[PDB]
Design a binder for this molecule. Structure first.
Ligand SMILES: CCCCCCSC[C@H](NC(=O)CC[C@H]([NH3+])C(=O)O)C(=O)NCC(=O)O
Ligand SMILES: CCCCCCSC[C@H](NC(=O)CC[C@H]([NH3+])C(=O)O)C(=O)NCC(=O)O
Lengths: 209, 209
């Protein structure tokens, strides 16, 4: 299974942890967006949206990190706890996954990427929105061990990939004890977290330091 | 199943078509965001993220339209006619769902929201990104009957709710023959499309006055 990615990319790291969780080996294919590698004719033929992470499992090309996460869990996952089949349980995991992309990561990106890449002035309004995003997560975690319940799921892996990027960016998690508590839990229990930690650090040294 | 919504909302319309497709009746509860009704104490207790659509199926509160769509298909859907169980086929639908949220609808909002709710001038740069999104969809449809294959899936319902909004917004689909055709097939085969058409027409209440 070919895995086009970059350790610095949160969505890419979510997949790396998920692949570890299901014991799947990934053929790592570094794809430096900063060198336009995602725009090579070869990559465009596999993915016309030219984005990472992109997975190629025996000819089947797939992108959108969370779709890849689900695919791995359902196809190679032997334990139902990662992505439970119960509709209600699965619904909370799916809501959490969409929350991660459309709210948590999105607000992070909106607030930071303009500063990091375009060297533009920080936006106070977006900073407040980013904070509110973390607050929503703090609330979901109230009285729970993990994001979608008491079992570690792919939602936690996606959320961890994002939060680690937050941490490195310098977010102050003090006002959110549930998040802090859950984040520490993931570091200790999340399969392949080492890769997530390594990716966030690489992000810090390459585009933050 | 209490359905907190507004017809003008694309994500809400996506759920209405999906419920029509699964044969589930929704107890409609209009939630006028413009009046802060979503910020009402009681709603907040059901969904701290104060957003629509929000469904409450016999006490189980759930938001994020696409998570709701999947929940409805798996729990009440027959013959998985809208959401195949096959891992690979399901992955495409899921990737299509994430594309709808993070790219097609997201860029729509990015371009229109500031103009609609901040009456700010139109950002030509963001209009271009919005156009490329439709372009990605046009490519995905290359030689395909529907977004993720030959069968209409919840992906098509989500994409059609988003595209119906693009249409009433005056977007020009002439340069995207695959989208125009697909979209036509959706107006004619998507269960509950009439609700999508009506809600979209209502949305113009944000494009007129
Ligand atoms: C530079 C190192 C840090 C990168 C941080 C952003 S992740 C890279 C980016 N990919 C995405 O944003 C993926 C988002 C998608 N919703 C997912 O979950 O996979 C990309 O390929 N962007 C290029 C493109 O889409 O053209
Ligand atoms: C008012 C008519 C036009 C509405 C257009 C936007 S849809 C309403 C908006 N909801 C969303 O954006 C939901 C997005 C979510 N990703 C989903 O798919 O459900 C909301 O509740 N926003 C308020 C909030 O989040 O507080």
């Amino acid at each position: 299974m070919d895995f086009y990615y970059l350790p610095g990319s949160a969505p890419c790291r979510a997949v790396q942890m998920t692949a570890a969780a299901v014991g799947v080996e990934l053929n790592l294919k570094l794809t430096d967006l900063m060198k336009g590698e995602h725009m090579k004719p070869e990559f465009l033929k596999l993915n016309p949206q030219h984005c990472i992470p992109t997975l190629v499992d025996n000819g089947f090309a797939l992108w959108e990190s969370r779709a890849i996460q689900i695919y791995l869990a359902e196809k190679y996952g032997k334990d139902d706890k990662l992505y439970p089949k119960d509709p209600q349980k699965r619904a909370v995991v799916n809501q959490r996954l969409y929350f991660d992309m459309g709210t948590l990561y999105q607000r992070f990106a909106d607030y930071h990427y303009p500063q990091i890449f375009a060297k533009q002035p920080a936006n106070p309004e977006n900073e407040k929105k980013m904070k509110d995003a973390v607050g929503f997560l703090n609330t979901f975690l109230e009285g729970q061990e993990y994001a979608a319940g008491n079992d570690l799921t792919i939602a936690d892996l996606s959320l961890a990939a994002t939060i680690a990027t937050y941490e490195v960016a310098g977010f102050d998690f003090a006002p959110y004890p549930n998040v802090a508590a859950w984040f520490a839990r993931c570091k200790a229990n999340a399969p392949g977290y080492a890769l997530n930690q390594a990716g966030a650090d690489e992000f810090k040294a390459k585009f933050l330091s």
